[PDB]
Design a protein around this ligand. Structure first.
Ligand code: NA
Lengths: 241, 246, 229, 197, 213, 236, 234, 214, 232
């Protein structure tokens, strides 16, 4: 459609807000990011395409710490993704201020999703060209993983993928029995799936970013250490052959 | 936002304001409203566009509005826009009275509204008020006065003038028959009905007259009743027929 | 927001959104109002699309204060804004003056609000003409107010679908000192001209205003008037 | 501390102010003028706290002059007085209340001569005669004694002399010289300053 | 009720020579009749050719020093050069006066080098009135030191005494002896004596001991 | 054509053309290079003269004792965004009495420059920065852009003909970390003149250098200041 | 409030809205101003049923300074009122009255701010401001919608202002200046170029050294019409 | 806070070899009333820094909430940069001064212990933004009682070990229990070293009342 | 139709682009920086002999040690000249010193891209200033001449011109300029280069000249002083 696709304050005759759909295409063109809910936590893996070897490792970090107990993994226009992390950081900080404890992930997902939805209603602003996955572990609430898109929809996921290989990554996740497996195991299988769905012919070389949150980390979102990442990268290369 | 902007407050290439001109075309369709100065008074006579069998007649007028004790006005255009402007005129009249404890002079009250109308042409991005007003009044400085204004925020003082449907035809007819310095309110009332007979398509339900006069140190504003109008219609019909024979 | 008028003058010199709003009124479910000597009537078509609709729930004929009432043709949601606002304007008069608001003065205040949306920034006007019944100085009052913000005091009139037929029907058949018994009966006969179906207590709505203020008529009260038609 | 006086006649208004600009115990100026020309036929005489008098008086003066330029005719003494009252009344319950006492003497062509009185509270009162300051407590009873509504201007100056001479005899403050002005049909007229030994 | 000020005390001093500028202070910080600390010198380095002494309420001293430090950069960023000693003293007046209706309770004495190379002292009051001086004392023992500085540096009430200018040797010894005399008689002056010496070569700091009671 | 004028208007391609147009402000702007060793961080800038009479354009700016920048784009956006960095640095020195981490300063630029890309009647900052600075994590080169994206770097170049510079730097990466100061500056200068044609090369007029590390604060070298660094290798 | 950019630059570097405001000046009534030694004069071009007083285009701003205008008459009235306000507000701030340069600079500054501030189209007027300074030197300046201002010996604005300025460029000699009568005659000659049959269709006023403004009525105007046409023959 | 409700009394502090130690009784006094006899007036800021607070407990708990969140906000980035003991002390001086300068002060007097880059930090800050460093600190009435005893030992031996510093601090809190009416005999000691911030408590001092038989 | 803060595909603001195009319409001005002083010359472009020549101030005093010449929209310039004049005396108030020529030019350069529609104050700008400024003064770093354009780009210049024949005059400045020349040679160079591009033939009433030396203040040249220089 043409004419009706310039403002988020304008529906088309079909009943579609094309500005929101065009923001979702910037995510579909962006590189693949994934995350799976384990038995004892949640793991994140990201295909970070290196534009130049001139850049340092741990630059353009598409994995972020929203809170001490929550991890954000993003795909889309990265500037928008960082500002969404700043919104989620403050929103989580506001909960601790108001109620004196760590924000629940479903609530954190809902409150940041309504932030994302607000930008899909007006000519005065545009939607966020970014989908992201929020993940967390706790004592009582346990392992939880939610994904949000440019429109502002929030759903909970056992497994989830966003980016270039959205559909291709999901059929590889369906094979894994994530509900029985642990975080220690899942890091190998998350690293495997990125190496599969990575297009070596089309795209340049990449760095695998890995983070996690679980009973291993005492419900704290840390990076996966270099011991375990390089074990999982080795597993990805040799099991590809 | 920028695509949806009408841009009411801009000069067109010719060097002129489109919404101001287009608002004056709205007035050219609306009812024939005129005013005539005299030595012993001032009058306003208007075409009554609210004309049906089932209309109620609550108010003492329909197009005529009192403003101050010594002042009044009639309108031509969108009547809703007139209700805003007349309300604001009344507010200005009392704002002056609160401040100085005298009635507002007629030119000052007209300039005050016309400064506001001009603002809607220059800034705010808003459409102008689609109303021309004819004002009547008395003050201690210039006495019996008649003023015209229009959507641009421009005003002028007139001896006699008209606005509405057949505006130009009525003014040229007034330019023939008006005698400066020599006209009384009785002679002016005859000329008012003469001009409205030309313009309109003449029963007294379709006409609405009022007369501002000064009797015994206090201003007297009164609408004419339908007995007064109908006898003045028959006096025109007889005076028109008496000339036709001779 | 948007700080510019959406309603503007065309080369002809007409405020096009107001005439387009009048088309929304003109294509609305019809409404009638009649001023008797001893009272005022307001009646309208309440024919919803199915028997599934709960008829008792939402009302077209609504009170503003205990002595003034209201009805519309055209847009329903727009109408509800004007009802809430008119209700406030009535209390804002009563608080200040300690007197029931004159019907003329309520119409003038709501007219000013209706005018506001034909000029102010980033808003269309209302797609509604209101009919406002009342009782002030021991006598009845009926007023129209249409999307422009212009108002007309009527003895009787019609709105919506077949308003031209309702107005001419009324013109010849209205007498200037009718009884309120007869006027209620006339209002239902004006609606039966424009109706498509068998009329009932449910599918039309009537309110009245007299010595003891305004009220909405019950279904059984309407059913008595429908028995002799 | 300062002193004003006005005496309305049949077709005129006589007025007079002292000329001491005081500071602490010192008489900084013997030639100070406390009258402000509003119009051709209006004087505002103003007394009070040091900076408040001139700032207020001049604000009014310029707005009266603005009324002339805007409309091609000056304010009447009635209009000017109620304008002066409206400003002082609005400042009264605000951050910057002007403590000013004032007389507005004038002449209208229609209404004739007019002397108005106003305290710092902004109560406006039209009077046949009036006075401000501690000197008013001595001199007002002299005006009650000898004033009539039909008083001639040459006699009204000799009445003024008795008030001003009473200040030299009884009032503890110096006040050696006084400004004097008449308003009538022909506008404002300066007169000889009533000095003493 | 809540009092936002408190007297922390200490003495400051500055002298302007022909080729130098001393700016000195004690190191005692007090409150009530207790000592907060013995190592709180009131000299603060600003540029290579300018130093400031600040005494009074210490909360304002810390803030006002941090303001001057912040403003020095802002000038250098705008104008691509360091502020002159006279330009700092002019700027300080505006900062002190910007808080006219809630004072920085800080007695300031700037000392350093003017653009002509010579010594230049600028003394202040809390709301920002200032002047250039040859010498000035400030803070707790202002009254004790100032008339001795009037005597020995100004040559006041003396005749048959040749008006020789101050050598840096002589001025340093004077600053030691006056702060010794203040420490004896002032409760708020004591512990140690910071002395900053501003010449064209740079700043150098000495630390002579004083009474610790 | 329809999706070209406003930053809020997403294209059907999934792109915002007003960002990508603002990127071209950097590219048509003059060349500049940045790189780091184990101990230092250096910026080198080809200063573009207007005419040959007029003096050369100032391309390297001071931010703090520990941070400075080199620019490429609209000079007003450069100066505005420079003053933002200067102020946030000043806030950190005021509040904490401790220099602001360079990665944290760079995050605030990204946060700031992103804001107007999402709002109607606003535009991105038409300027790219290379940001040299030393802190508790050693020396850094960071890049920023009109898109509000920022990059941590071993080295980088941006501006007119800067592809030539990036190719030179990508070869000598492992050399930079081991280099002394004089060898690190000489590497940055050789990357810069690769952007130029074979006809013209580096002089003391058209080159500026900006250096910070462990020993040294962010010093800028322009005219006779530069003469020590150039006199070493000059052929091709 | 309305924050739209009204006046902007074009492909070829024109401020189109200011250029269209200058087209609105060129339609308005022909206003003309002339300077002298002792006297300064203004005059304007022109229905039987009107009050001449109300549509007067010569306006006093202070006791010493007045002005004429040409263009949109509503737009003129706001500039005149805000000029009148600034004249008294100037006296309130620094006692001494307004020089003709200062008020012209203000009107220019006001006109310029409307060509650059958001929400506002320019003022569609050019003005001809005249008067006597503190020291007593006579002055004549001219502003336009852009907010540029320049002093003049004499100038025209409005309908056919080229043909009036062409006439003024030739005719402005030292002979016409010396007397009060001769400067007034020069203004009427200039207006007679554009005014199709002059006399009755000419507004005209004057300012002398210490004296205030003075409008000449049609009886006084027709005296100088006789003094022009007799002298042409001889 | 113009009028404080629940006040805490003296907070002690002293540097030792490779660390700093602070002490503060666990009492919230409502005027004369010992209301809350089990509340921690010491706070772990980060791995490098700790904070004890005299004065109003609600204002200290606000500062605990604000600092805790700042340290959380910093640890999210994880970029090898931390707030030093001096940096928190610098911030807290600017916090109290800003609130003082709005005539709405946080009614506290605080001691900041810390160890980082080999060096020991001990820093004073009051409600008005008066701040400094010293080898020992004692806020409130402890300025008049305890600070004499710390300066007595530090004159004779400038550099103490942890056990010398701990047994000194235990001797000080004994004197405060005897002589301060607003103190109590429940307290916490908090040390900081290379290892991090330990908070030991609740403790008590062994008293002696044999002078009552004279 | 598009916004004021819109980039072209080339990577530059349309309204800034079009503000440079507006300076071509403006009348030409020259400034030459020398060790002995900065001279500044400009054509008045007098459309009528009725127009008073002395009331076309296109060179003006910013301070006793700085001047500024202008081309383009004359009304737009007077806003920027007043802001500079304010800035210098605000600096004198705060710091008790003179500003540098660079520091003044930078202060005016900060105002260049302070325009826009949404997010703005009551008196904030819709468009840029369509004005090129040639600053010229003597500060502590010798005599300095600085150029500015509508973008905000400002730079030191040994010699430069702006206006309709900016292109033509800059070629003449390239040949004529020498770095070790005198002030009086640089003054006469400008009037030679101005006489060519005008073709009203140059005279004392038709132009403004002004100089700033180290010893002497900002001086704008009179009729008699211009008539002495006129032609040799
Ligand atoms: Na002592």
């Amino acid at each position: 459609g043409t004419g009706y696709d310039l403002s988020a304050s304008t529906f088309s005759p079909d009943g579609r807000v094309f500005q929101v759909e065009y923001a979702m295409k910037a995510v579909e063109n962006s590189s693949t990011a994934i995350g799976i809910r384990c038995k004892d936590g949640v793991v994140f893996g990201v295909e970070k395409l290196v534009l130049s070897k001139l850049y340092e490792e741990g630059s353009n970090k598409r994995l972020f710490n929203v809170d001490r107990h929550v991890g954000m993994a993003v795909a889309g226009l990265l500037a928008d993704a960082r500002s969404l992390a700043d919104i989620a950081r403050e929103e989580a900080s506001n909960f601790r201020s108001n109620f004196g404890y760590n924000i629940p992930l479903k609530h954190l997902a809902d409150r940041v999703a309504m932030y994302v939805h607000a930008y899909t209603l007006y000519s005065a602003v545009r939607p966020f060209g970014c989908s992201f996955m929020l993940g967390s572990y706790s004592v009582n609430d346990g392992a939880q993983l939610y994904m949000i898109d440019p429109s502002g929809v929030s759903y909970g996921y056992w497994g989830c993928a966003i980016g270039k290989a959205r559909q291709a990554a999901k059929t590889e996740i369906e094979k894994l029995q994530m509900k029985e497996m642990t975080c220690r195991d899942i890091v190998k299988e998350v690293a495997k799936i990125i190496y599969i769905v990575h297009d070596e012919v089309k795209d340049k070389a990449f760095e695998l970013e890995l983070s996690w949150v679980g009973e291993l980390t005492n419900g704290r979102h840390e990076i996966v250490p270099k011991d375990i990442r390089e074990e999982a990268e080795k597993y990805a290369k040799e099991s590809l052959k | 936002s920028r695509r949806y902007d009408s841009r009411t407050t801009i000069f067109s290439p010719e060097g002129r304001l489109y919404q101001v001109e287009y608002a004056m075309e709205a007035i050219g369709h609306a009812g024939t409203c005129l005013g005539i100065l005299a030595n012993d008074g001032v009058l306003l006579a208007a075409e009554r566009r609210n004309i049906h069998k089932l209309l109620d007649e609550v108010f003492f007028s329909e197009k005529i509005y009192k403003l101050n004790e010594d002042m009044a006005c009639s309108v031509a255009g969108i009547t809703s826009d007139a209700n805003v402007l007349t309300n604001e005129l009344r507010l200005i009249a009392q704002r002056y009275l609160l401040q100085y404890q005298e009635p507002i002079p007629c030119e000052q009250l007209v300039t005050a509204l016309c400064d506001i109308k001009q603002a809607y042409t220059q800034f705010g991005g808003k459409r102008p008020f689609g109303v021309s007003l004819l004002y009547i009044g008395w003050d201690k400085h210039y006495g019996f006065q008649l003023y015209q204004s229009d959507p641009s925020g421009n005003y002028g003082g007139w001896k006699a003038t008209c606005i509405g449907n057949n505006s130009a035809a009525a003014v040229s007819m007034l330019k023939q028959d008006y005698k400066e310095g020599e006209m009384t309110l009785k002679s002016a009332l005859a000329l008012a009905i003469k001009v409205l007979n030309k313009t309109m398509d003449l029963s007294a339900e379709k006409v609405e007259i009022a007369t501002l006069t000064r009797e015994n140190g206090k201003t007297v504003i009164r609408v004419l009743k339908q007995k007064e109008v109908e006898q003045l219609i028959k006096k025109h019909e007889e005076e028109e027929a008496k000339a036709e024979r001779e | 927001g948007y700080s510019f008028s959406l309603t503007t003058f065309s080369p002809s010199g007409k405020l096009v959104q107001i005439e387009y709003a009048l088309a929304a009124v003109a294509g609305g479910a019809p409404s009638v109002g009649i001023k008797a000597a001893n009272g005022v009537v307001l009646a309208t078509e309440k024919k919803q699309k199915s028997i599934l609709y709960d008829e008792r729930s939402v009302h077209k004929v609504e009170p503003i204060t205990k002595h003034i009432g209201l009805v519309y043709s055209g847009m329903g949601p727009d109408y509800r804004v004007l009802v809430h606002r008119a209700r406030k304007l009535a209390q804002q008069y009563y608080l200040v003056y300690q007197e029931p608001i004159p019907t003329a003065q309520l119409v003038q205040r709501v007219a000013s609000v209706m005018q506001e949306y034909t000029q102010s920034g980033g808003v269309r006007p209302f797609g509604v003409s209101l009919l406002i019944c009342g009782w002030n100085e021991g006598r009845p009052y009926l007023f129209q107010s249409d999307p422009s913000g212009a108002y007309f005091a009527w003895k009787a009139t019609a709105m919506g679908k077949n308003y031209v037929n309702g107005k001419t029907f009324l013109e010849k058949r209205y007498n200037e000192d009718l009884e309120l018994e007869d006027a209620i009966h006339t209002a239902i006969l004006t609606l039966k001209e424009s109706f498509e179906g068998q009329m009932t207590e449910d599918n039309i709505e009537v309110g009245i205003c007299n010595e003891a203020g305004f009220r909405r008529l019950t279904p059984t009260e309407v059913k008595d008037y429908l028995a002799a038609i | 501390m300062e002193y004003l006086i006005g005496i309305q006649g049949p077709d005129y208004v006589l007025v007079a102010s002292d000329r001491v600009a005081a500071s602490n115990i010192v008489q900084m100026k013997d030639d100070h003028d406390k009258m402000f020309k509003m119009s051709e036929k209006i004087l505002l005489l103003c007394v009070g706290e040091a900076g408040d008098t001139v700032q207020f008086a001049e604000y009014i003066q310029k707005n009266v002059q603005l009324y002339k330029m805007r409309n091609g005719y000056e304010l009447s003494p009635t209009a000017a007085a109620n304008f002066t009252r409206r400003n002082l009344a609005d400042c009264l319950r605000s951050r910057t209340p002007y403590h000013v006492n004032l007389l507005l003497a004038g002449y209208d062509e229609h209404e004739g001569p007019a002397l108005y009185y106003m305290d710092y509270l902004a109560a406006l009162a039209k009077a046949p005669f009036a006075a401000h300051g501690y000197g008013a407590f001595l001199t007002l009873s002299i005006l009650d004694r000898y004033y009539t509504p039909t008083i001639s201007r040459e006699r009204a100056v000799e009445l003024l002399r008795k008030c001003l001479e009473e200040l030299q005899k009884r009032f503890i403050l110096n006040l050696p010289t006084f400004s004097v002005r008449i308003i009538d049909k022909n506008g404002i007229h300066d007169l000889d300053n009533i000095s003493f030994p | 009720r809540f009092s936002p000020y408190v007297f922390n005390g200490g003495t400051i001093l500055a002298i302007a020579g022909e080729d130098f500028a001393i700016v000195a202070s004690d190191t005692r910080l007090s409150e009530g009749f207790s000592i907060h600390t013995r190592d709180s010198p009131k000299c603060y380095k600003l540029t290579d050719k300018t130093v400031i002494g600040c005494s009074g309420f210490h909360g304002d001293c810390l803030t006002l020093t941090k303001i001057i430090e912040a403003r020095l950069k802002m000038y250098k960023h705008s104008n691509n050069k360091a502020m002159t000693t006279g330009a700092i003293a002019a700027m300080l007046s505006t900062i002190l006066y910007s808080r006219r209706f809630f004072p920085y309770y800080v007695y300031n004495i700037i000392g350093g080098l003017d653009e002509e190379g010579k010594g230049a002292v600028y003394s202040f009051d809390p709301v920002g009135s200032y002047q250039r001086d040859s010498f000035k004392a400030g803070g707790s023992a202002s009254a004790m030191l100032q008339p001795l500085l009037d005597n020995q540096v100004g040559f006041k009430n003396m005749q048959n005494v040749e008006h020789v200018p101050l050598s840096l040797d002589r001025a340093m010894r004077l600053v030691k002896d006056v702060f010794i005399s203040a420490a004896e008689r002032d409760v708020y002056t004591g512990d140690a004596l910071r002395i900053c010496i501003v010449t064209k070569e740079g700043i150098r700091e000495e630390t002579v001991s004083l009474r610790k009671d | 054509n329809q999706y070209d004028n406003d930053v809020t208007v997403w294209s059907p391609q999934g792109r915002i053309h007003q960002i990508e147009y603002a990127m071209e402000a950097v590219k048509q702007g003059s060349a500049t290079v940045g790189l780091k060793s184990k101990t230092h961080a250096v910026l080198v800038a080809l200063k573009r003269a207007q005419s040959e009479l007029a003096a050369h354009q100032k391309k390297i700016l001071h931010v703090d004792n520990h941070i400075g920048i080199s620019i490429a784009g609209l000079t007003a956006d450069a100066r505005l965004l420079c003053n933002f960095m200067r102020q946030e640095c000043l806030d950190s020195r005021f509040v904490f009495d401790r220099p602001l981490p360079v990665s944290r300063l760079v995050s605030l630029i990204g946060s700031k420059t992103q804001i107007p890309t999402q709002r109607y009647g606003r535009r991105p900052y038409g300027v790219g920065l290379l940001i040299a600075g030393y802190d508790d994590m050693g020396p850094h080169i960071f890049q920023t852009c009109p898109s509000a994206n920022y990059f941590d770097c071993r080295a980088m170049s941006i501006g007119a003909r800067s592809q030539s510079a990036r190719t030179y730097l990508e070869r000598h990466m492992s050399e930079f970390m081991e280099c002394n100061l004089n060898e690190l500056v000489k590497h940055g200068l050789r990357a810069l003149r690769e952007t130029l044609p074979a006809e013209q090369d580096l002089t003391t007029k058209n080159v500026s250098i900006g250096i910070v590390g462990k020993d040294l604060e962010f010093t800028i070298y322009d005219d006779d200041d530069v003469s020590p660094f150039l006199e070493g290798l000059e052929e091709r | 409030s309305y924050d739209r950019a009204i006046t902007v630059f074009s492909p070829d570097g024109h401020l189109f809205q200011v250029e269209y405001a200058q087209e609105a000046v060129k339609k308005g009534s022909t206003a003309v101003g002339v300077r002298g030694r002792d006297i300064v004069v203004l005059g304007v071009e022109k229905a039987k049923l009107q009050d001449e007083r109300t549509v007067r285009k010569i306006c006093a701003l202070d006791d010493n300074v007045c002005m004429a205008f040409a263009g949109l008459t509503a737009d003129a009235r706001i500039v005149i009122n805000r000029a009148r306000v600034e004249c008294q507000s100037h006296r309130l701030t620094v006692e001494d009255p307004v020089t003709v340069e200062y008020i012209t600079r203000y009107i220019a500054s006001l006109k310029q701010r409307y060509t650059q501030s958001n929400g506002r189209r320019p003022f569609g007027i050019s003005a001809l401001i005249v008067g006597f300074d503190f020291d007593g030197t006579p002055r004549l300046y001219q502003t336009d919608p852009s907010g540029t201002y320049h002093a003049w010996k004499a100038n025209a604005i409005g309908r056919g202002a080229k043909s009036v300025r062409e006439f003024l460029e030739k005719n402005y000699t030292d002979e016409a200046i010396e007397t009060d009568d001769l400067t007034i005659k020069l203004v009427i000659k200039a207006l007679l170029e554009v005014v199709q049959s002059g006399g009755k269709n000419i507004e005209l006023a004057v300012m002398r050294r210490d004296q205030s403004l003075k409008i000449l009525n049609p009886e006084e105007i027709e005296k100088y019409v006789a003094e022009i046409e007799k002298e042409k023959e001889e | 806070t113009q009028n404080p409700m629940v006040t805490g009394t003296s907070v002690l502090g002293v540097k030792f070899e490779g660390g700093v130690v602070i002490a503060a009784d666990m009492l919230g006094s409502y005027g004369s009333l010992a209301r809350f006899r089990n509340i921690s007036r010491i706070m772990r800021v980060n791995n490098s820094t700790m904070l004890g607070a005299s004065g109003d407990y609600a204002d200290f708990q606000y500062l605990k909430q604000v600092l805790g969140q700042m340290v959380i906000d910093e640890e999210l980035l994880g970029d090898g940069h931390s707030y030093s003991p001096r940096a928190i002390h610098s911030w807290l001086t600017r916090a109290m001064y800003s609130r003082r300068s709005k005539m709405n002060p946080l009614w506290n007097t605080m001691v900041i212990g810390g160890y980082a880059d080999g060096e020991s930090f001990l820093g004073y800050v009051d409600m008005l933004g008066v701040a400094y460093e010293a080898p020992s600190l004692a806020t409130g009435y402890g300025a008049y009682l305890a600070q004499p005893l710390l300066r007595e030992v530090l004159e004779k031996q400038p550099v103490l070990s942890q056990t010398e510093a701990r047994d000194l601090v235990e001797r000080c809190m004994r004197v405060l229990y005897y002589r301060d009416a607003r103190s109590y005999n429940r307290f916490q000691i908090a040390t900081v070293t290379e290892k991090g911030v330990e908070i030991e408590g609740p403790l008590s001092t062994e008293t002696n009342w044999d002078i009552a038989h004279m | 139709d598009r916004g004021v803060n819109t980039f072209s595909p080339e990577g530059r603001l349309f309204q800034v682009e079009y503000a440079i195009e507006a300076i071509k319409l403006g009348s030409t001005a020259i400034g030459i920086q020398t060790s002995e002083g900065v001279c500044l010359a400009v054509e008045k472009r007098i459309t009528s002999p009725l127009m008073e020549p002395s009331s076309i101030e296109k060179i003006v005093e910013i301070d006793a040690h700085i001047g500024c010449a202008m081309s383009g929209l004359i009304a737009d310039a007077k806003t920027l000249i007043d802001k500079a004049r304010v800035e210098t005396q605000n600096h004198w108030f705060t710091y008790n010193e003179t500003m540098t020529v660079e520091s003044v030019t930078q202060a005016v350069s900060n105002l260049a891209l302070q325009f826009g529609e949404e997010d703005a104050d009551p008196g904030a700008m819709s468009r840029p200033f369509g004005v090129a400024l040639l600053f010229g003064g003597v500060d502590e770093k010798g005599p300095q001449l600085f150029h500015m354009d509508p973008s905000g780009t400002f730079v030191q210049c040994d010699a430069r011109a702006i206006g309709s024949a900016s292109e033509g005059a800059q070629s003449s400045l390239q040949e004529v300029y020498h770095k070790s020349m005198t002030l009086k040679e640089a003054i006469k160079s400008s009037l030679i280069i101005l006489k060519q591009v005008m073709e009203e033939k140059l005279n004392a009433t038709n132009i403004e000249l002004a100089t700033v030396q180290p010893g002497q203040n900002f001086h704008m040249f009179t009729k008699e002083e211009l008539e002495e220089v006129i032609k040799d």
